[PDB]
């Protein structure tokens, strides 16, 4: 049950991986998880703030 995924290559190829142990805590690190959501910290306000609008009106 091999898993084929894509390699980290430049911009402007695949690799194969097999799990050998029955404990999921032995697998390799989850390196490719490029998901970001800065909205919890940068803009935590109750009311939406349009950029091109007076913050206080």
């Amino acid at each position: 049950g091999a898993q084929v995924s894509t390699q980290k290559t430049g911009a402007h190829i695949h690799y194969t991986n097999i799990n050998y142990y029955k404990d999921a805590a032995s697998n390799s690190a989850n390196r490719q998880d490029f998901t970001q959501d800065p909205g919890k910290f940068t803009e935590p306000v109750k009311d939406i703030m349009i950029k091109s609008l007076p913050a206080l009106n």
Partner: protein
């Protein structure tokens, strides 16, 4: 445990090997590529370009621009010789330092045809005729124009187009030759002779110069990468 067996050649460091290794910087974003003029994909794209040949490497002439000049003047005779050197593109001093020679040194075997272009650099009033010749090995070098006329020759008529080409073809018993000195793979001799004379009018210089450019043809090839016997060092540079 999958039962395995190690074979001779384990934990050895062969410098010309091809394996995969763990990366020291994992998940590293490499700078994007940009378009740069003049991308090289083969060393024979460089050897196929002309470069000036130092034929007059005699005495102190190597420490000036006179090594690249071939002197040709008006002669009160005919059929005398201008120059000569052997077809040793990587061993003879005439050829070992040119682009072709430099690239050839990094290899052991070579094959293919050779181009020798000659440019006449007199005045527009000077006229001449020359007889470029290549002689395969088996006899000596030709010592007169009656012995050089019998080989692969071109008769260069000087005027307007000031540049002639002598192509030295591949005439060998083997597919490849050696870049180092080896009698079993001797190349031959290249000579140049006066066909008629250099003729000039009054108030014009009766002494002119020729220049030579060497390059490789489409069939040229090299093999056995090795180290060049030119560069050297005594201690690590700083």
């Amino acid at each position: 445990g999958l039962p395995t067996m190690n074979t001779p050649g384990s934990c050895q460091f062969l410098t010309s090997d091809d394996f995969q290794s763990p990366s020291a910087m994992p998940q590293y974003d490499v700078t994007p590529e940009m378009r740069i003029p003049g991308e090289v994909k083969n060393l024979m794209e460089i050897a196929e370009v002309d470069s000036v040949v130092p034929v007059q490497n005699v005495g102190e002439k190597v420490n000036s621009m006179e090594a690249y000049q071939i002197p040709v003047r008006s002669n009160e005779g005919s059929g005398t010789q201008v120059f000569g050197f052997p077809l040793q593109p990587g061993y003879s001093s005439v050829f070992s330092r040119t682009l072709l020679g430099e690239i050839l040194n990094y290899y052991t075997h070579w094959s293919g045809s050779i181009k020798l272009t000659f440019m006449f650099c007199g005045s527009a009033m000077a006229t001449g005729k020359f007889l470029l010749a290549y002689s395969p090995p088996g006899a000596g070098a030709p010592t007169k124009r009656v012995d050089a006329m019998l080989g692969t020759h071109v008769v260069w008529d000087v005027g307007l187009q000031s540049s002639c080409v002598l192509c030295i073809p591949w005439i060998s018993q083997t597919h490849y030759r050696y870049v180092t000195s080896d009698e079993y793979t001797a190349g031959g001799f290249i000579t140049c002779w006066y066909q008629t004379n250099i003729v000039v009018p009054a108030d014009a210089q009766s002494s002119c110069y020729i220049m030579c450019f060497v390059s490789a043809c489409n069939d040229f090839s090299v093999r056995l990468l090795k180290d060049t016997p030119f560069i050297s060092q005594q201690n690590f540079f700083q």
